[PDB]
Design an enzyme around this catalytic site. Sequence first.
Site, PDB file in Angstrom:
ATOM      1  N   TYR A  12       0.800  -1.217   0.000  1.00 30.76           N
ATOM      2  CA  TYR A  12       0.000   0.000   0.000  1.00 30.76           C
ATOM      3  C   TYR A  12       0.839   1.277   0.000  1.00 30.76           C
ATOM      4  O   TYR A  12       0.539   2.239   0.708  1.00 30.76           O
ATOM      5  CB  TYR A  12      -1.016  -0.011   1.147  1.00 30.76           C
ATOM      6  CG  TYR A  12      -1.972  -1.180   1.105  1.00 30.76           C
ATOM      7  CD1 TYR A  12      -2.865  -1.346   0.052  1.00 30.76           C
ATOM      8  CD2 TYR A  12      -1.984  -2.114   2.125  1.00 30.76           C
ATOM      9  CE1 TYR A  12      -3.752  -2.428   0.023  1.00 30.76           C
ATOM     10  CE2 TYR A  12      -2.863  -3.195   2.104  1.00 30.76           C
ATOM     11  CZ  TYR A  12      -3.742  -3.345   1.059  1.00 30.76           C
ATOM     12  OH  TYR A  12      -4.605  -4.428   1.066  1.00 30.76           O
ATOM     13  N   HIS A 125      -5.477  -9.546   6.300  1.00 32.42           N
ATOM     14  CA  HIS A 125      -4.179  -9.102   6.801  1.00 32.42           C
ATOM     15  C   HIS A 125      -3.866  -9.584   8.222  1.00 32.42           C
ATOM     16  O   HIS A 125      -2.702  -9.573   8.649  1.00 32.42           O
ATOM     17  CB  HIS A 125      -4.086  -7.571   6.730  1.00 32.42           C
ATOM     18  CG  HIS A 125      -4.016  -7.032   5.340  1.00 32.42           C
ATOM     19  ND1 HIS A 125      -2.911  -7.214   4.528  1.00 32.42           N
ATOM     20  CD2 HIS A 125      -4.900  -6.317   4.603  1.00 32.42           C
ATOM     21  CE1 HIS A 125      -3.123  -6.644   3.361  1.00 32.42           C
ATOM     22  NE2 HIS A 125      -4.326  -6.084   3.379  1.00 32.42           N
TER      23      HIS A 125
HETATM   24  C1  LIG Z   1      -8.893  -4.137   0.543  1.00 25.98           C
HETATM   25  S1  LIG Z   1      -7.805  -2.859   1.218  1.00 25.98           S
HETATM   26  C2  LIG Z   1      -8.980  -1.550   1.643  1.00 25.98           C
HETATM   27  C3  LIG Z   1     -10.383  -2.073   1.408  1.00 25.98           C
HETATM   28  C4  LIG Z   1     -11.492  -1.038   1.433  1.00 25.98           C
HETATM   29  N1  LIG Z   1     -12.488  -1.489   2.397  1.00 25.98           N
HETATM   30  C5  LIG Z   1     -12.097  -1.037   0.049  1.00 25.98           C
HETATM   31  O1  LIG Z   1     -13.048  -1.779  -0.184  1.00 25.98           O
HETATM   32  O2  LIG Z   1     -11.652  -0.340  -0.859  1.00 25.98           O
HETATM   33  C6  LIG Z   1      -7.369  -3.495   2.858  1.00 25.98           C
HETATM   34  C7  LIG Z   1      -7.204  -2.387   3.897  1.00 25.98           C
HETATM   35  O3  LIG Z   1      -7.102  -2.951   5.193  1.00 25.98           O
HETATM   36  C8  LIG Z   1      -6.240  -2.128   5.965  1.00 25.98           C
HETATM   37  N2  LIG Z   1      -5.714  -2.802   7.176  1.00 25.98           N
HETATM   38  C9  LIG Z   1      -4.873  -3.883   7.250  1.00 25.98           C
HETATM   39  N3  LIG Z   1      -4.644  -4.184   8.547  1.00 25.98           N
HETATM   40  C10 LIG Z   1      -5.328  -3.304   9.319  1.00 25.98           C
HETATM   41  C11 LIG Z   1      -5.438  -3.155  10.693  1.00 25.98           C
HETATM   42  N4  LIG Z   1      -4.791  -3.963  11.532  1.00 25.98           N
HETATM   43  N5  LIG Z   1      -6.220  -2.139  11.185  1.00 25.98           N
HETATM   44  C12 LIG Z   1      -6.895  -1.296  10.327  1.00 25.98           C
HETATM   45  N6  LIG Z   1      -6.776  -1.441   8.964  1.00 25.98           N
HETATM   46  C13 LIG Z   1      -6.005  -2.439   8.471  1.00 25.98           C
HETATM   47  C14 LIG Z   1      -5.159  -1.693   4.984  1.00 25.98           C
HETATM   48  O4  LIG Z   1      -4.532  -0.490   5.375  1.00 25.98           O
HETATM   49  C15 LIG Z   1      -5.928  -1.578   3.673  1.00 25.98           C
HETATM   50  O5  LIG Z   1      -6.254  -0.239   3.351  1.00 25.98           O
END
Ligand SMILES: C[S@@+](CC[C@H](N)C(=O)[O-])C[C@H]1O[C@@H](n2cnc3c(N)ncnc32)[C@H](O)[C@@H]1O
EC number: 2.1.1.103
Length: 259
Positions: A12, A125
């Site tokens: 990212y 994640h």
């Molecule tokens: C699929 S992407 C974003 C998805 C967004 N909901 C969309 O549909 O466009 C996954 C997101 O999860 C976030 N993420 C990963 N681990 C996280 C955590 N421990 N706490 C909050 N956000 C997290 C990442 O920063 C990333 O932006």
Amino acid sequence: NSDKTFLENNQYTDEGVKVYEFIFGENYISSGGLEATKKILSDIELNENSKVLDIGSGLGGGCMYINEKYGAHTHGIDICSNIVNMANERVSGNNKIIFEANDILTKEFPENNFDLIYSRDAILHLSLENKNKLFQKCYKWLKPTGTLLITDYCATEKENWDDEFKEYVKQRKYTLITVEEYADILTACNFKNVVSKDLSDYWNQLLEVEHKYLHENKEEFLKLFSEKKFISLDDGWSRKIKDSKRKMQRWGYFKATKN
Ligand SMILES: C[S@@+](CC[C@H](N)C(=O)[O-])C[C@H]1O[C@@H](n2cnc3c(N)ncnc32)[C@H](O)[C@@H]1O
């Protein structure tokens, strides 16, 4: 004890996020963009007094849509500070949308707070231990009458993964479990009316639309990025299409209530 730096510096990065937005659509970095979001929320009821949490809110498209459709208060949490900065640049003059940079695992919210806790392709994640811890928090945070609504990347049982799929998961540090194991976590966390759907066929459809779009808009992609990034994205979608068809990689949908 955090993956924040790992995520910000690799998958990212700003450019990585912009590449995803090119293929998923404006304000989205996950499957199906706006169209899948309309579908996923098609049977959800909220109003201007509702409070919604979006876990892993990304560029904020989901919060934008939920606020537009229902008038609800939306609070998105994302661990990547650069993504949150981008999200905040996409919305102005709206005190009912909040984007916050924080690790959901360390964030505190009041018990019995949210009408809807919503997450789209973010929980992949988290380690298995942390998925369970997160859903215990979600249970606490939901109002007695609240709903949990999730899509997430799932997979066939790990024993069945092939070399290329193992490498994909390892490189991204994903923890992918079966749709069934995921539902069992929700049941173990005391959620009621747990519904899971294997939406791998629909996911495959969304992937095909995206892949077609990428090919039809290659000239424009190359103006913005590089051929190297094109090839990586193209190959990545090709593998997801192949692996979703055979259900090696799966798309899970989950809905549950607190009571
Ligand atoms: C699929 S992407 C974003 C998805 C967004 N909901 C969309 O549909 O466009 C996954 C997101 O999860 C976030 N993420 C990963 N681990 C996280 C955590 N421990 N706490 C909050 N956000 C997290 C990442 O920063 C990333 O932006």
